[PDB]
Amino acid sequence: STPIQQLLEHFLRQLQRKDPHGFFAFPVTDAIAPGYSMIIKHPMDFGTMKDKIVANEYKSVTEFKADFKLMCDNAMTYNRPDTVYYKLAKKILHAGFKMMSKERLLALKRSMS
Numbered sequence: 001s002t003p004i005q006q007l008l009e010h011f012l013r014q015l016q017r018k019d020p021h022g023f024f025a026f027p028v029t030d031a032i033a034p035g036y037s038m039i040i041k042h043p044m045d046f047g048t049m050k051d052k053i054v055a056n057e058y059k060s061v062t063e064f065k066a067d068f069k070l071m072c073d074n075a076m077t078y079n080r081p082d083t084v085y086y087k088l089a090k091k092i093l094h095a096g097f098k099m100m101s102k103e104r105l106l107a108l109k110r111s112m113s
């Protein structure tokens with residue numbers, strides 16, 4: 001494991017704690033959510049992100065944050081605001097962007113000196 005892989009695994013584990021039922025653990029299928037593929041053209045989930053960390057597919061934290069935001073944006077686009085999925089995606093998005101904020105990353109950058 002590389003220092004980037006270790007850091008991204010840490011960020012991912014903390015995010016996955018917010019989804020205990022595993023709604024974001026694997027890709028959403030049309031069987032589980034009718035007409036999902038008709039609406040969502042760029043699917044994303046924690047499991048896909050996990051495989052990208054393991055395969056060393058993330059060159060930056062920015063790229064990781066973009067996949068995370070995409071996963072939350074998809075759930076907020078497909079599901080209506082009064083749903084469990086939309087509410088959880090908005091909660092997860094807020095938790096991820098405070099944890100991986102520019103301030104938290106600048107403090108990390110400074111500690112790498």
Ligand SMILES: COc1cc(-c2cn(C)c(=O)c3cnccc23)c(OC)cc1CN(C)C
Nearest residue numbers: 021022023024026027028032033075079085
């Ligand atoms: C009802 O349980 C599930 C829900 C979803 C689910 C997720 N998201 C993100 C959605 O937007 C969504 C929207 N509509 C319907 C369902 C979902 C799921 O997708 C991987 C898997 C399960 C199966 N479960 C045993 C883990």
